[PDB]
Amino acid sequence: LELRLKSPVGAEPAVYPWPLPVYDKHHDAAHEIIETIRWVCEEIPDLKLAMEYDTKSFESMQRLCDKYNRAIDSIHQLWKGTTQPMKLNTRPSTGLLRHILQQVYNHSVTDPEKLNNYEPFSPEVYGETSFDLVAQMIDEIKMTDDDLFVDLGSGVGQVVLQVAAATNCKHHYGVEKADIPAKYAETMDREFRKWMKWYGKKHAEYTLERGDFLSEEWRERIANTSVIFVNNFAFGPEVDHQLKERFANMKEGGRIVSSKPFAPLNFRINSRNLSDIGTIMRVVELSPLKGSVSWTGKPVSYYLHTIDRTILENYFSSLKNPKLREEQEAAR
Numbered sequence: 001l002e003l004r005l006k007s008p009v010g011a012e013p014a015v016y017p018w019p020l021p022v023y024d025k026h027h028d029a030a031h032e033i034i035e036t037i038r039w040v041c042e043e044i045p046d047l048k049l050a051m052e053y054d055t056k057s058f059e060s061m062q063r064l065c066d067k068y069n070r071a072i073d074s075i076h077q078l079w080k081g082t083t084q085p086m087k088l089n090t091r092p093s094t095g096l097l098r099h100i101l102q103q104v105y106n107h108s109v110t111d112p113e114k115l116n117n118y119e120p121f122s123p124e125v126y127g128e129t130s131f132d133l134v135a136q137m138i139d140e141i142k143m144t145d146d147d148l149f150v151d152l153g154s155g156v157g158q159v160v161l162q163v164a165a166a167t168n169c170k171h172h173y174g175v176e177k178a179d180i181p182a183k184y185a186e187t188m189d190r191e192f193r194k195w196m197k198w199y200g201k202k203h204a205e206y207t208l209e210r211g212d213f214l215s216e217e218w219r220e221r222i223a224n225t226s227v228i229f230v231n232n233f234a235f236g237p238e239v240d241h242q243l244k245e246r247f248a249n250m251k252e253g254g255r256i257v258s259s260k261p262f263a264p265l266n267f268r269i270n271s272r273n274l275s276d277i278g279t280i281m282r283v284v285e286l287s288p289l290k291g292s293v294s295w296t297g298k299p300v301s302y303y304l305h306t307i308d309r310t311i312l313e314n315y316f317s318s319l320k321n322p323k324l325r326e327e328q329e330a331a332r
């Protein structure tokens with residue numbers, strides 16, 4: 001006994017055995033099926049029109065699947081007529097992408113318990129993943145095809161995949177040091193590509209790698225990245241310090257988005273702090289997403305750092321000008 005869902009673009013059908021597997025306490029294949037149908041119906045209005053359940057009854061679930069499959073066949077017949085078929089070159093909506101990543105994770109991370117010891121993957125937010133927060137980041141931070149993107153410490157790769165699905169960066173990378181998450185990343189990658197093809201959706205190029213971002217090789221790679229995401233909230237002093245030294249080699253207009261700032265928000269340059277990272281970057285607290293919950297109980301905010309050496313330039317200009325020099329020397 002089994003259930004099948006046809007792909008809206010003619011990829012091979014999704015096939016689930018009956019009884020439908022359970023993935024964890026809040027996820028199972030029955031609701032994966034229901035949500036797939038719901039999202040294919042958002043992809044294709046005509047299907048939504050044609051569509052109007054006991055998830056423990058094989059007959060109830062077979063009837064839903066049959067109704068979806070017959071509607072997909074009719075839509076495919078419609079597209080052989082004069083109706084234009086669904087555009088094949090598009091990015092997924094945030095809602096669809098959320099479903100896709102959950103589906104990819106369901107099928108990739110076989111034993112969620114093996115991951116526990118590499119926690120936290122989302123230390124900045126109580127009770128949810130970074131997904132909704134990253135979806136905001138992505139809309140605030142303009143990225144283009146000149147950009148290279150990296151998630152430093154990428155886990156099973158979920159944030160890299162989300163950004164690659166939504167943006168035009170030339171390449172997206174994840175780097176992950178631990179064996180278990182890195183190995184799950186390899187499956188996440190194959191599953192993601194499979195499911196994105198199944199929905200008829202495109203993503204930018206990406207690569208998930210094994211490695212330590214504090215290594216010597218990564219030194220020059222960080223220097224040549226234009227957009228770095230790093231979830232550093234729970235990092236200690238020495239790692240944050242080591243990262244600051246890597247960032248000091250980034251090019252002007254390079255950006256770092258993090259869960260804890262790497263410099264104070266109102267850094268004031270003076271003769272004792274001249275070599276601190278604050279001398280070369282604007283730092284701002286981004287708008288928090290309403291509804292998200294931080295450790296304080298308030299909405300979570302991320303931190304945007306933009307490499308901008310005009311701050312340092314202006315300090316040196318001011319040291320050359322006796323009036324400006326006396327003012328500076330006055331305060332401090």
Ligand SMILES: Cc1ccc(NC(=O)NCCCN(C[C@H]2O[C@@H](n3cnc4c(N)ncnc43)[C@H](O)[C@@H]2O)C(C)C)cc1
Nearest residue numbers: 121130153154155159176177178212213229230231258259
């Ligand atoms: C705003 C903002 C939001 C989200 C994100 N991205 C994000 O959440 N990605 C998911 C993984 C989170 N990672 C933990 C993983 O890092 C590895 N890791 C730790 N140190 C590492 C290292 N030195 N080298 C490679 N991997 C490392 C650990 O083994 C662990 O698998 C963070 C918490 C570090 C970025 C920016």
